[PDB]
Design a protein around this ligand. Structure first.
Ligand SMILES: Nc1ncnc2c1ncn2[C@@H]1O[C@H](CO)[C@@H](O)[C@H]1O
Ligand SMILES: Nc1ncnc2c1ncn2[C@@H]1O[C@H](CO)[C@@H](O)[C@H]1O
Ligand SMILES: Nc1nc(N)nc(-c2ccccc2)n1
Ligand SMILES: Nc1nc(N)nc(-c2ccccc2)n1
Ligand SMILES: [K+]
Ligand SMILES: [K+]
Lengths: 330, 330
């Protein structure tokens, strides 16, 4: 028996969410459906143009941890906030979900990361992220005991943007594999992949990463192809297990030559896609650390993703464990 | 032509919203459906026990100003926040809605007011409010030109809790009436009425307040009676116009001997009652300042309130002006 099922590591972010029309994205040169990194000046400018908003704790890996805890798994999180009101909100929300979170802030400045997320009528989300205190995450924030005691350590591709987070991840990989644990990553975003293609391929091919999460766009970006079948063949060769999501078209889990297709749950209406991939990783990794079949890990993933897209905000406000029980995934 | 249809004045608050079971309220001695005032220590204690939450700009009168602007009216607001992140969120949200908001923060401590709002399965909301920077609102915050240029100035009974806000209101009343404008108040909360019963009756009877908003419990509390009929008769004698809401039973508008009964709108589900009375006031005052009949003012009131109770959070995330046109209220 181990202390944690899943440790996640990522950029600690509070989301600022508003709806906009499609013209708003064009006028503000915001790349639709993408993570757009912005500086402090652009953050102020975009906020000045944004409509009334709501705030919720975010961060891709933060969301994933919360989702694991929600399903009933034991989760931990590494990520760096500031000693400010946004940081206090982030700390409260993740701990309140029952996730182990002990990363200390290093001061009030830079302030806690925030992402302005614009949700269009089609439910798509376009994020505009000021990293703030995330730039300070480094090897000093690795709780070695936690990595040692976690069945899976999962991290964001997004961590390659701040300067020193990658060093922390390399320490995690070493500790995890020394203790017979597994390392997992999400490719995060297709432009993220564009930025760090060589590095991400290295992580997988050298076996520092065991389990890779991607959506169709990220997988195409990774191999700079328009051929999805090529991309699936290549990703399966480059990592031990790949879980590749295809929105409404479901998911496919790959292992060597094995392929496991999973249906997406049928939706009433796509409210806000924010958090879909994160909560897919929640369900998959909850399943995985419970010893479930890869198909069942896929099903748990699709269940969690389907639920999170029917609400505003990235972390489900309802019981995932109860939804899983009702679904006979249990 | 004047600058504003409706100026509102109230406690500037950011809401922190979470769902709980009925047992949570009993365990924590939270009065259900009430506004519970708390000190800084109790705030910390309740937050530590609260689940994962979302944040949204609140404040009764702030919500009402936002609603009027949403409907297409011209609104202004007075309320005091701190120079902190929470205050920046509040300032952004109200201004982003098109409400004139120019109240200057006086420093970073006390910090911006927050209310932890617990929503139970029945959709009722129980609020736990730390007034923070609201205690600093006073006469210096009255923008006399704004009061002079507003058709109606509306304020919260809740303003009787901080020490000096009442002086600001007495100044508003004088300026408004000297310029031939009208004053309005909401009784806010039944326990608030208990605290300031005589003060509120004096405001009405002296003619400082022209239009009074109440729900059934506030009206009963005002006259310390269980006889709703007696309550309606007395409230009509004590003010020029009373608008009394009755939840699913709709509302009744009273003027002298006149009575106008309005039905509540049909709804999918009571998701969260937070802001229902605030947004009734929004619809009613929008109508009132557009020259509409008392009955149509009530209809616009019921439409706005019915919309806000089907969403999480106190300020509608949809277009109230579109719903009004759709409902044929124009
Ligand atoms: N650069 C980033 N790194 C990690 N997470 C991010 C980034 N930008 C946005 N997010 C988070 O992505 C989540 C949706 O997957 C949102 O909750 C948002 O907080
Ligand atoms: N003491 C208070 N004064 C004014 N508004 C409050 C108070 N407590 C809670 N609220 C606000 O009441 C609104 C719902 O009517 C919520 O948005 C909340 O912010
Ligand atoms: N208790 C609780 N747990 C989660 N995950 N979310 C909530 C919640 C409910 C409504 C609004 C915001 C958060 N509440
Ligand atoms: N543009 C916009 N306007 C309002 N009134 N509300 C929102 C909003 C949408 C989603 C979440 C929070 C606020 N957005
Ligand atoms: K969502
Ligand atoms: K509401």
């Amino acid at each position: 028996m181990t202390r944690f099922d899943v440790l996640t590591v990522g950029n600690a972010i509070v989301d600022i969410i508003s709806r906009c029309n499609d013209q708003f994205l064009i006028d503000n040169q915001i790349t639709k459906a993408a993570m757009n990194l912005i500086d402090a000046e652009r953050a102020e400018l975009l906020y000045s143009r944004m409509g009334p908003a709501l705030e919720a704790s975010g961060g891709s890996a933060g969301n994933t941890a919360a989702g694991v805890a929600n399903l009933g798994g034991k989760a931990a999180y590494f990520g760096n906030v500031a000693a400010d009101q946004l940081g206090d909100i982030f700390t409260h929300d993740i701990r309140a979900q029952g996730v182990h979170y002990q990363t200390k802030p290093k001061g009030a400045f830079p302030p806690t990361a925030r992402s302005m997320i614009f949700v269009t009528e089609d439910g798509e989300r376009s994020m505009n992220t000021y990293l703030g205190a995330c730039v300070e995450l480094g090897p000093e924030d690795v709780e070695a005991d936690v990595v040692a005691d976690a069945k899976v350590t999962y991290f964001e591709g997004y961590l390659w943007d701040p300067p020193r987070a990658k060093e922390a991840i390399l320490d995690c990989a070493r500790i995890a594999h020394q203790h017979g644990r597994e390392m997992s990553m999400t490719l995060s975003d297709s432009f993220c992949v564009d930025r760090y293609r060589g590095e991400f391929l290295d992580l997988m091919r050298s076996g520092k990463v065991d389990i890779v999460f991607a959506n169709r766009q990220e997988a195409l970006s990774l191999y700079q192809t328009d051929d999805f079948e090529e991309a699936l063949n290549r990703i399966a060769a480059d990592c031990k297990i790949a879980a590749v999501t295809m929105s409404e078209n479901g998911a496919v889990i790959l292992k060597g030559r094995e392929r496991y297709y999973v249906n997406a749950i049928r939706i009433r209406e796509v409210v806000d896609t924010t958090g879909a991939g994160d909560l897919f990783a929640s369900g998959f990794l909850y399943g995985y650390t419970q010893g479930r079949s890869l198909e069942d890990c896929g099903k748990l993933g699709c269940l969690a993703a389907g639920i999170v897209i029917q609400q505003i905000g990235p972390r489900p406000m309802t019981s995932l464990s109860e939804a899983a029980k009702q679904a006979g995934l249990i």
